[PDB]
Amino acid sequence: SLPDAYWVDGDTGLKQTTKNIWSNVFMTAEELAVIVPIPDALIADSDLPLWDEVK
Amino acid sequence: SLPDAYWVDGDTGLKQTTKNIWSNVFMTAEELAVIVPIPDALIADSDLPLWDEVK
């Protein structure tokens, strides 16, 4: 919020009051993940280096 | 106001007379003001310099 101001009615006009306000804002971390399983025989027999190719 | 001039009817016609006017304009000062009240407890408790924030 923001404060006000007001016009005074003459040399002895009664002055007025105001207030300011604040609030909170947030951020939340979340997780994503996956698994890729491979037979150890297929890792050895392949000429393509499958771990470096899936990364 | 502005003065006149007049065409004169021949070599020996009577010349006429004219005059100016002036007046006044005014500007008046007026007041705007406000009050911000805060408890002594909040000025001590809070870590924000709370009078310097509202100015």
Calculate the alpha carbon distances from A39 to A26, A49, B53 in Å: 44, 13, 65
Joined together, the tokens standing for residue A46 give: 């392949």
Q: How was this structure determined?
A: cryo-EM
Q: Rounded CA gap, B29 and B24, in Å?
A: 17
Listed in sequence order, the residues at least 6 apart from A43 whose beta carbon sits closer than 8 Å to its beta carbon are A50, A51
- Shortest distance, CA B46 to any CA of chain A (angstroms): 13
Query: A35 with B53: CB under 8 angstroms?
Result: no
Kindly provide the resolution of this structure in angstroms, with one decimal: 2.7
Query: A19 with A3: CB under 8 angstroms?
Result: yes
> Which of these, A6, A16, A20, lies nearest to B38 by C-alpha position?
A20
- Shortest distance, CA B34 to any CA of chain A (angstroms): 5
Who among A7, A13, A19 is closest to B36 (CB)? A19
CA B11 from centroid of its chain's CA atoms: 52
Who among B30, B34, B37 is closest to A4 (CB)? B34
